Amino acid sequence: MHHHHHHASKPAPSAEHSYAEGEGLVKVFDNAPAEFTIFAVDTKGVARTDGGDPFEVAINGPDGLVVDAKVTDNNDGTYGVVYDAPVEGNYNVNVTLRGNPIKNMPIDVKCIEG
C-alpha cells in the first residue's frame, strides 16, 4: 500500500502542491449533494504517503449561506469532499491547509435548486 502510516511524524502539504477536482467544483444542487477531490503533495511530487492532514473548504453562497464542505481522506494521497446547494445562485470556494492559504482561490461554482 503506498499511502500508509509508517511513523509518528508527517511532511506538510503546500500551496504549489495541493490542487482539487471534480463535479463539486462545477455544479451543485438541493437533492443531489455534490463531490470533488483534493490531490495533495508535500513537496516530493509523488502523492502524499499518509493520511489525515487537516484541511478546510470554507465557502460563501448568496448572503447568509456560509458553508463548509466536509472533508474525508480517501487513503491514497487524495480526499473526497461533499457539499450541497439550496439555491439557484453561486458558491465561492476557498480551500486551506492546516488553516493556511494557498494559490488560485477563491473560485466559483454554480448552484441550482435540484
Curated annotation (Swiss-Prot):
Highest taxon above the source species: Eukaryota
Filamin repeat start and end residues: 10-111
Subunit structure: Homodimer.
Domain note: The rod domain contains six 100-residue motifs that appear to have a cross-beta conformation.
Function recorded in the entry: F-actin cross-linking protein.
Protein name: Gelation factor
The gene coding this protein: abpC
